Amino acid sequence: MRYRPFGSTGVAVSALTLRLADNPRLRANDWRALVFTALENGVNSFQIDGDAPELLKGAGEAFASVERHLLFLTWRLRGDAKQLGPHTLDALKRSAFEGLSLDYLDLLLINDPQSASLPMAFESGLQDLQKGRALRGLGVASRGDIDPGLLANDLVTAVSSPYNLSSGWAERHRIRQASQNNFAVIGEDFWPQALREVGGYEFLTNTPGWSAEDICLGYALTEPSLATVRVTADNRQEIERLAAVVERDLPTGVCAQIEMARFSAQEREKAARRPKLAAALEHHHHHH
Ligand SMILES: Nc1nc2c(ncn2[C@@H]2O[C@H](COP(=O)(O)OP(=O)(O)O)[C@@H](OP(=O)(O)OP(=O)(O)O)[C@H]2O)c(=O)[nH]1
């Protein structure tokens, strides 16, 4: 495992962040041993993206067993960002703080309200946790441009964003600016939908020694703008195979094909417009 500085917060996170997403097929001991495999493989950044009794139980017991200051725990708070109020912090106390048995969260990661401002009730409560030494940072996950006003907020110490193989220099630049303005950037969807099925993406499955989950995670990890790539793991063999990818070097053949293929793709993604004015062909013409 490799570790990167979380932007300016002064704490180190593993290059991978394992996301515990509610899953009806894992009992508490299953979640416990998941988190254990993660720690044993050097992963110290978790994201809790669920509130199931069995998950908080097992994740809480595992987190509980190592020293709290080795761990970076992100709580993923979904729903419309502009509906968050007192109720949300009642939910947060019971799920994040009692449920996992933490005294502080390293980060709370909300949806983008596409808005200069959060709700009054919520923002107040967050500064209350803040002073209570009980929430290190706020974070805003977003697909477009977070509002410069919201980024100005002093609670806001991080963003998360889809960055992957497919991403545009469009998408990329934003993640880079964020990094320069001292925001920590969390990488998401590293293996995309488009590819779950001149250049073309055949090399993704033909590369001797590499899988596509693996090649794709490969690329995500080469972006310095990203403080950590988010991964998600049904199980133990997966966490093992992805923590391995961090120590491997993408073969420079694959890196070149990753870029031809990307051009190729977004070329035909712009043969799909089709503006038909059967004009511009022979006919005297204009008065100038
Ligand atoms: N990175 C990331 N961002 C998230 C996630 N969930 C919500 N967001 C952010 O919140 C904005 C609005 O999301 P919500 O309205 O809460 O729910 P939605 O994600 O289903 O739209 C999103 O813009 P948008 O939804 O892309 O635009 P629009 O077409 O909804 O206007 C996106 O920037 C997530 O899992 N990851």
Short mmCIF file of C-alpha atoms and ligand atoms in Angstrom, two decimals:
data_model
loop_
_atom_site.label_atom_id
_atom_site.label_comp_id
_atom_site.label_asym_id
_atom_site.label_seq_id
_atom_site.Cartn_x
_atom_site.Cartn_y
_atom_site.Cartn_z
CA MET A 1 0.00 0.00 0.00
CA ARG A 2 0.92 3.70 -0.70
CA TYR A 3 -0.34 6.69 1.25
CA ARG A 4 -0.99 10.27 0.12
CA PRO A 5 -1.55 13.43 2.11
CA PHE A 6 -5.27 14.29 2.42
CA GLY A 7 -4.92 17.73 0.72
CA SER A 8 -3.96 20.15 3.61
CA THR A 9 -5.68 18.35 6.60
CA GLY A 10 -2.17 16.97 7.56
CA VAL A 11 -3.45 13.27 7.90
CA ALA A 12 -2.30 10.39 5.55
CA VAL A 13 -4.80 8.10 3.74
CA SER A 14 -3.98 4.88 1.84
CA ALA A 15 -4.13 5.30 -1.98
CA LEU A 16 -7.36 3.14 -1.86
CA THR A 17 -10.49 4.00 0.19
CA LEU A 18 -12.81 0.98 0.77
CA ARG A 19 -16.56 1.95 0.66
CA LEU A 20 -18.91 -0.20 2.84
CA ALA A 21 -22.24 -0.03 0.97
CA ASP A 22 -25.32 -1.68 2.55
CA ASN A 23 -25.54 -5.26 1.27
CA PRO A 24 -28.26 -7.69 2.39
CA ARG A 25 -25.95 -10.77 2.16
CA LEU A 26 -23.27 -9.88 4.82
CA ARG A 27 -23.85 -10.57 8.55
CA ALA A 28 -21.89 -8.50 11.14
CA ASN A 29 -18.86 -10.89 11.37
CA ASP A 30 -18.65 -10.67 7.49
CA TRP A 31 -18.36 -6.81 7.64
CA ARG A 32 -15.87 -7.14 10.55
CA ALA A 33 -13.52 -9.51 8.59
CA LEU A 34 -13.94 -7.31 5.45
CA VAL A 35 -12.54 -4.27 7.34
CA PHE A 36 -9.80 -6.57 8.87
CA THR A 37 -8.59 -7.77 5.41
CA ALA A 38 -8.61 -4.02 4.41
CA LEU A 39 -6.36 -3.02 7.42
CA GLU A 40 -4.09 -6.11 6.94
CA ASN A 41 -3.70 -5.02 3.24
CA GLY A 42 -2.70 -1.44 4.43
CA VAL A 43 -6.10 0.29 3.63
CA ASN A 44 -6.89 2.84 6.41
CA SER A 45 -9.48 5.06 4.56
CA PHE A 46 -13.08 3.80 4.94
CA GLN A 47 -16.33 5.35 3.66
CA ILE A 48 -19.60 4.15 5.32
CA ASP A 49 -22.38 4.40 2.69
CA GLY A 50 -25.22 2.60 4.55
CA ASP A 51 -26.88 2.45 7.99
CA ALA A 52 -27.86 -1.31 8.21
CA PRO A 53 -27.70 -2.57 11.80
CA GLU A 54 -25.34 -5.46 10.83
CA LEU A 55 -22.87 -3.15 8.94
CA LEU A 56 -22.34 -0.43 11.63
CA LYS A 57 -22.05 -3.35 14.17
CA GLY A 58 -19.27 -5.22 12.31
CA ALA A 59 -17.56 -2.11 10.89
CA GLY A 60 -17.70 -0.55 14.39
CA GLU A 61 -16.12 -3.63 16.04
CA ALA A 62 -13.30 -3.73 13.39
CA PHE A 63 -12.58 0.06 13.53
CA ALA A 64 -12.75 -0.30 17.34
CA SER A 65 -9.93 -2.96 17.43
CA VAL A 66 -7.07 -0.77 15.92
CA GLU A 67 -6.09 2.67 17.34
CA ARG A 68 -8.60 5.39 16.14
CA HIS A 69 -5.74 7.71 14.90
CA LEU A 70 -4.61 5.20 12.15
CA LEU A 71 -8.08 5.39 10.53
CA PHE A 72 -9.61 7.97 8.16
CA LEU A 73 -13.45 7.46 8.42
CA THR A 74 -15.67 9.28 5.85
CA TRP A 75 -19.52 9.17 6.37
CA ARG A 76 -21.44 9.38 3.08
CA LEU A 77 -24.64 11.43 3.63
CA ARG A 78 -27.00 11.20 0.58
CA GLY A 79 -30.40 12.80 -0.20
CA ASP A 80 -31.04 16.38 -1.50
CA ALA A 81 -28.38 18.52 0.25
CA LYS A 82 -31.03 21.33 0.59
CA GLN A 83 -33.33 19.10 2.80
CA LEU A 84 -30.64 18.55 5.54
CA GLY A 85 -31.70 20.04 8.93
CA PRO A 86 -31.91 19.04 12.65
CA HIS A 87 -33.41 15.55 11.77
CA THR A 88 -30.22 14.77 9.74
CA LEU A 89 -27.96 15.32 12.81
CA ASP A 90 -30.32 13.11 14.95
CA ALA A 91 -29.78 10.42 12.25
CA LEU A 92 -25.99 11.14 12.27
CA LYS A 93 -25.66 10.86 16.07
CA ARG A 94 -27.50 7.44 16.09
CA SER A 95 -25.92 5.92 12.90
CA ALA A 96 -22.33 7.33 12.68
CA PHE A 97 -21.47 8.17 16.35
CA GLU A 98 -23.44 5.59 18.45
CA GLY A 99 -23.71 2.99 15.64
CA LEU A 100 -19.92 2.79 14.84
CA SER A 101 -18.80 3.88 18.37
CA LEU A 102 -16.69 6.86 17.11
CA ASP A 103 -16.20 10.17 19.05
CA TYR A 104 -15.25 12.04 15.83
CA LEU A 105 -15.68 11.63 12.02
CA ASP A 106 -12.63 12.46 9.78
CA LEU A 107 -15.08 13.64 7.05
CA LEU A 108 -18.81 13.93 6.24
CA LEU A 109 -19.48 13.77 2.44
CA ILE A 110 -22.76 15.40 1.30
CA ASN A 111 -24.38 15.70 -2.16
CA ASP A 112 -23.73 19.03 -4.10
CA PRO A 113 -26.71 21.36 -3.39
CA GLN A 114 -25.80 23.14 -6.69
CA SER A 115 -26.00 26.29 -4.46
CA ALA A 116 -23.67 28.89 -2.84
CA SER A 117 -25.07 27.82 0.60
CA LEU A 118 -26.19 24.85 2.79
CA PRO A 119 -29.32 24.98 4.99
CA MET A 120 -29.01 27.19 8.18
CA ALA A 121 -30.03 24.46 10.70
CA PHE A 122 -27.48 21.96 9.21
CA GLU A 123 -24.45 24.34 8.74
CA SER A 124 -24.93 25.57 12.37
CA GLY A 125 -24.98 21.95 13.73
CA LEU A 126 -21.74 21.21 11.74
CA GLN A 127 -19.83 24.17 13.36
CA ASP A 128 -21.21 22.75 16.68
CA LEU A 129 -19.55 19.31 15.94
CA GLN A 130 -16.42 21.21 14.64
CA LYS A 131 -15.95 23.08 18.03
CA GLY A 132 -16.84 19.79 19.87
CA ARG A 133 -13.62 18.49 18.10
CA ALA A 134 -16.11 15.91 16.57
CA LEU A 135 -16.00 16.40 12.71
CA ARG A 136 -12.63 17.13 10.99
CA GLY A 137 -14.12 18.19 7.65
CA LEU A 138 -17.06 18.60 5.28
CA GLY A 139 -16.90 17.20 1.73
CA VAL A 140 -19.00 17.72 -1.40
CA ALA A 141 -19.33 14.87 -3.98
CA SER A 142 -20.38 16.32 -7.40
CA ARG A 143 -20.28 15.50 -11.18
CA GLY A 144 -20.16 19.12 -12.50
CA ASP A 145 -18.54 22.30 -11.00
CA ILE A 146 -19.16 22.82 -7.20
CA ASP A 147 -20.15 26.52 -6.56
CA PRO A 148 -17.03 28.69 -5.81
CA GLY A 149 -19.06 30.20 -2.92
CA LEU A 150 -19.68 26.73 -1.33
CA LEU A 151 -15.96 25.79 -1.84
CA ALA A 152 -15.21 29.10 0.01
CA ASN A 153 -17.07 27.70 3.13
CA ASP A 154 -14.46 26.79 5.84
CA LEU A 155 -16.27 23.55 6.76
CA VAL A 156 -15.46 22.37 3.17
CA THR A 157 -12.03 20.52 3.22
CA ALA A 158 -12.66 17.97 0.32
CA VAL A 159 -14.50 17.05 -2.93
CA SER A 160 -15.23 13.65 -4.57
CA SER A 161 -15.79 13.20 -8.33
CA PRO A 162 -15.94 10.46 -11.00
CA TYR A 163 -12.41 10.27 -12.47
CA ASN A 164 -11.52 7.24 -14.58
CA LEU A 165 -10.15 5.89 -17.87
CA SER A 166 -13.18 7.50 -19.73
CA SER A 167 -12.90 11.01 -18.13
CA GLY A 168 -12.36 14.17 -20.31
CA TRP A 169 -9.57 16.84 -19.80
CA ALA A 170 -12.81 18.78 -19.06
CA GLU A 171 -13.49 16.41 -16.03
CA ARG A 172 -9.67 16.17 -15.25
CA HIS A 173 -8.85 19.95 -14.99
CA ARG A 174 -11.56 20.46 -12.28
CA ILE A 175 -10.02 17.70 -10.04
CA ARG A 176 -6.59 19.38 -10.62
CA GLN A 177 -7.75 22.94 -9.77
CA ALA A 178 -9.44 21.56 -6.58
CA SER A 179 -6.05 19.95 -5.61
CA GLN A 180 -4.19 23.29 -6.20
CA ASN A 181 -6.77 25.23 -4.09
CA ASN A 182 -5.78 22.75 -1.28
CA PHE A 183 -9.05 20.64 -1.43
CA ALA A 184 -8.44 16.85 -1.01
CA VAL A 185 -9.97 15.00 -3.99
CA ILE A 186 -11.62 11.53 -3.63
CA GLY A 187 -11.73 9.53 -6.92
CA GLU A 188 -14.86 7.50 -7.71
CA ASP A 189 -16.31 5.17 -10.44
CA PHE A 190 -12.79 4.03 -11.59
CA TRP A 191 -14.31 1.18 -13.67
CA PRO A 192 -17.23 2.71 -15.62
CA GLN A 193 -20.61 1.50 -17.03
CA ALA A 194 -19.72 2.17 -20.74
CA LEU A 195 -17.06 -0.69 -20.40
CA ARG A 196 -18.95 -3.36 -18.27
CA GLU A 197 -20.61 -4.80 -21.54
CA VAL A 198 -8.52 4.02 -34.58
CA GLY A 199 -7.97 2.45 -31.09
CA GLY A 200 -10.85 0.66 -29.23
CA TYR A 201 -11.03 -1.02 -25.78
CA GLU A 202 -10.01 -4.63 -26.71
CA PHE A 203 -6.59 -4.34 -24.92
CA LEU A 204 -8.60 -4.01 -21.61
CA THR A 205 -9.12 -7.83 -21.65
CA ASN A 206 -6.14 -8.90 -23.91
CA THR A 207 -3.33 -7.52 -21.67
CA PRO A 208 -1.38 -10.58 -20.36
CA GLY A 209 -1.27 -10.42 -16.52
CA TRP A 210 -3.91 -7.65 -16.10
CA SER A 211 -7.77 -7.72 -15.71
CA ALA A 212 -9.93 -4.70 -16.71
CA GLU A 213 -11.05 -3.86 -13.02
CA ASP A 214 -7.19 -3.89 -12.54
CA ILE A 215 -6.10 -1.82 -15.65
CA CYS A 216 -8.83 0.76 -14.90
CA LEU A 217 -7.78 1.10 -11.20
CA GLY A 218 -4.23 1.32 -12.63
CA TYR A 219 -5.05 4.59 -14.50
CA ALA A 220 -7.06 6.21 -11.63
CA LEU A 221 -3.93 5.82 -9.40
CA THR A 222 -1.64 7.76 -11.89
CA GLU A 223 -3.68 11.01 -11.33
CA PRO A 224 -1.81 13.01 -8.62
CA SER A 225 -4.83 15.40 -8.17
CA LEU A 226 -6.56 12.41 -6.42
CA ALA A 227 -5.66 11.89 -2.71
CA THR A 228 -7.36 8.44 -2.83
CA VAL A 229 -9.31 6.19 -5.27
CA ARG A 230 -12.62 4.81 -3.90
CA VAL A 231 -13.16 1.04 -4.27
CA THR A 232 -16.12 -1.23 -3.19
CA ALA A 233 -15.71 -4.91 -2.20
CA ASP A 234 -18.42 -7.65 -1.83
CA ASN A 235 -15.59 -9.74 -0.27
CA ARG A 236 -11.98 -10.55 0.72
CA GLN A 237 -10.28 -11.76 -2.49
CA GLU A 238 -11.42 -8.46 -4.20
CA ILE A 239 -9.83 -6.19 -1.52
CA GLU A 240 -6.66 -8.29 -1.88
CA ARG A 241 -6.50 -8.00 -5.73
CA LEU A 242 -7.06 -4.14 -5.72
CA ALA A 243 -4.56 -3.30 -2.93
CA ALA A 244 -2.08 -5.31 -5.14
CA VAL A 245 -2.74 -3.02 -8.14
CA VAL A 246 -1.33 -0.08 -6.07
CA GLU A 247 2.22 -1.59 -6.05
CA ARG A 248 2.09 -2.57 -9.77
CA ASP A 249 3.12 -0.24 -12.63
CA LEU A 250 0.72 0.10 -15.61
CA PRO A 251 2.67 -1.28 -18.65
CA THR A 252 3.44 1.84 -20.79
CA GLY A 253 1.88 -0.01 -23.80
CA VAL A 254 -1.52 -0.03 -21.95
CA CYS A 255 -1.11 3.72 -21.01
CA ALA A 256 -0.80 4.71 -24.71
CA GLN A 257 -3.77 2.54 -25.78
CA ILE A 258 -5.78 4.03 -22.88
CA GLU A 259 -5.43 7.44 -24.63
CA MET A 260 -5.94 6.37 -28.27
CA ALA A 261 -9.08 4.45 -27.18
CA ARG A 262 -10.28 7.52 -25.22
CA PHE A 263 -9.90 9.80 -28.35
CA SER A 264 -11.56 7.10 -30.62
CA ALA A 265 -14.59 6.92 -28.20
CA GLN A 266 -15.28 10.69 -27.74
CA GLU A 267 -14.81 11.08 -31.59
CA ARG A 268 -17.94 8.92 -32.34
CA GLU A 269 -19.72 10.39 -29.20
CA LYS A 270 -19.65 13.53 -31.54
CA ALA A 271 -20.74 11.74 -34.80
CA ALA A 272 -23.97 11.44 -32.69
CA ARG A 273 -25.20 15.05 -33.15
CA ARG A 274 -26.38 15.04 -36.89
CA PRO A 275 -27.36 18.66 -37.89
CA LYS A 276 -28.96 17.52 -41.58
CA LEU A 277 -29.24 20.88 -43.26
CA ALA A 278 -28.72 19.36 -46.71
CA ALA A 279 -27.41 22.83 -47.53
CA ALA A 280 -23.91 23.92 -48.61
CA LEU A 281 -23.91 22.28 -52.05
CA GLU A 282 -23.69 24.12 -55.70
CA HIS A 283 -27.00 26.69 -56.25
CA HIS A 284 -25.80 32.25 -57.86
CA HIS A 285 -25.84 33.22 -54.12
CA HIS A 286 -25.95 36.09 -51.46
CA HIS A 287 -26.19 39.94 -51.66
CA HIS A 288 -23.24 41.03 -49.42
N1 LIG B 1 -19.76 12.23 -7.36
C1 LIG B 1 -21.00 11.96 -6.92
N2 LIG B 1 -21.88 12.99 -6.93
C2 LIG B 1 -23.16 12.80 -6.50
C3 LIG B 1 -23.61 11.46 -6.03
N3 LIG B 1 -24.92 11.62 -5.67
C4 LIG B 1 -25.26 12.92 -5.89
N4 LIG B 1 -24.21 13.64 -6.40
C5 LIG B 1 -24.13 15.12 -6.77
O1 LIG B 1 -25.31 15.86 -6.36
C6 LIG B 1 -25.88 16.57 -7.47
C7 LIG B 1 -27.37 16.41 -7.38
O2 LIG B 1 -27.55 15.10 -6.82
P1 LIG B 1 -28.90 14.77 -6.01
O3 LIG B 1 -29.90 15.74 -6.63
O4 LIG B 1 -28.68 14.73 -4.47
O5 LIG B 1 -29.27 13.26 -6.50
P2 LIG B 1 -28.88 12.70 -7.97
O6 LIG B 1 -27.42 12.38 -7.67
O7 LIG B 1 -29.65 11.39 -8.20
O8 LIG B 1 -29.17 13.85 -8.96
C8 LIG B 1 -25.34 15.83 -8.67
O9 LIG B 1 -25.39 16.54 -9.91
P3 LIG B 1 -26.00 15.61 -11.07
O10 LIG B 1 -27.04 14.76 -10.34
O11 LIG B 1 -24.83 15.00 -11.82
O12 LIG B 1 -26.83 16.57 -12.11
P4 LIG B 1 -28.46 16.52 -12.44
O13 LIG B 1 -28.67 15.96 -13.84
O14 LIG B 1 -29.03 15.64 -11.30
O15 LIG B 1 -28.88 17.98 -12.45
C9 LIG B 1 -23.94 15.43 -8.27
O16 LIG B 1 -23.02 16.49 -8.63
C10 LIG B 1 -22.57 10.36 -6.05
O17 LIG B 1 -22.76 9.16 -5.67
N5 LIG B 1 -21.33 10.71 -6.49
#
